[PDB]
Homo-oligomer: A and B are copies of this chain.
Amino acid sequence: FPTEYFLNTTVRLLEYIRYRDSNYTREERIENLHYAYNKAAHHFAQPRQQQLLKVDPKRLQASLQTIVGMVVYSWAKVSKECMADLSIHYTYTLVLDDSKDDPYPTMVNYFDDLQAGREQAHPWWALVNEHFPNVLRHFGPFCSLNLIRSTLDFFEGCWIEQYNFGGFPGSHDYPQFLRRMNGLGHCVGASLWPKEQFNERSLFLEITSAIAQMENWMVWVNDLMSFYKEFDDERDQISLVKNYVVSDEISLHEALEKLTQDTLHSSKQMVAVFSDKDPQVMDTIECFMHGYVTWHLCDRRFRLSEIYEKVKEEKTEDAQKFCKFYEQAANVGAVSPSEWAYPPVAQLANV
């Protein structure tokens, strides 16, 4: 693991975007986390959900807490109900995100069943499409369409990843093709605009623009931040950075530099474009960018604490800047699970 370069790149990003999280007071944070967790926990504990969603209890629990954090930390302006419903949707996607399964058999009659209104054969689709209305009720038709497309894309992306194919050497378009596919970019981007707070028709151009630009910023930031948890992980391996290596036949070092440059430029344009636009829009965008980073630095899923410990000592400016940022984020989002994530889904299921 290029620890030395991981610190280099991460520091460049955090410093360039001027990472800082003022999204909530600690009381507000805990309050939202618990609300979202509580509703989702009861949802996933239902027998039907327990029966069709094939996932290890411990894994479901960890996935739910990771997503509640992501939603609460990054969608700081939407209502508690919206955070909760979104948390359920993104927990379904995270579960699929780490899974190993062959969709082929259950996708043979996908369209015909869809058109006829018959329950989907793939259990994931059966649960996701049944729950979807609870998510879409928060948005106008345009944003809703984006959520639907992006989730369908994501499903295809996880399907492709099952083949552990990083692209044919020379297939330069493959890496980003897959990343957009599995990125859930338009879903995340469009889910930032609840109709309760934003009028889809009045802000059509800014929202469309935000979806287009946020898609890349969002995915790339995760490619960089999650570069650590991914790397020695089997389910991953097939990633933008590693596919850049195989497909464009370049060095991991160059791949990371490529990713970092794109990310910095994406950040740059986010500012240029939205700085002088509707204040409410800029506010939501800012809350997302900052909270999104706080989430990557704190959440267990990305285990960046491991890199903190190993680097906490050595003083190389680059290593010190990382720990500073890591500490700053921890001071805001390092909330203990016992303060909000209870009771466990399992306990509610066996009730």
Interface residues of A (CB under 8 A from B): 103-104, 107-108, 110-112, 114-118, 129-130, 132-133, 136, 140-142, 144-146, 148-149, 152-153, 155-156, 159-160, 163, 165, 167-174, 177-178, 200-201, 204-205, 208-209, 211-213, 215-216, 265-266, 269, 272-273
Contacts of A212 in B (CB 8 A): 167, 171, 173-174, 177-178
Cross-chain contact of A171 among B146, B159, B209, B215 (Cβ < 8 A):
B209
The CA of A201 and the CA of B105, in the complex, are separated in Å by 11
Contacts of A177 in B (CB 8 A): 211-212, 215
In the A-B complex, list the 4 residue pairs whose CB atoms are closest, starting with the nearest.
A117-B117, A177-B212, A107-B141, A170-B272
15 contacts between A and B (CB under 8 A): A104-B140, A104-B142, A111-B132, A115-B132, A115-B133, A145-B159, A149-B156, A163-B205, A163-B208, A165-B204, A168-B205, A168-B209, A173-B269, A177-B211, A177-B212
Q: Which residue of B lies closest to A200 (CB)?
A: B104
**Once the chains bind, are A208 and B160 in contact (CB under 8 Å)?**
yes
Cross-chain contact of A152 among B149, B172, B208, B216 (Cβ < 8 A):
B149
CB distance from A100 to the nearest CB of B (A): 15
**Once the chains bind, are B116 and A173 in contact (CB under 8 Å)?**
no
Known contacts A107-B141, A177-B212; 16 further A-B pairs (Cβ under 8 A):
A107-B145, A108-B141, A111-B144, A115-B130, A142-B156, A142-B159, A145-B156, A145-B159, A148-B152, A149-B153, A167-B209, A173-B213, A173-B216, A173-B269, A174-B213, A177-B211
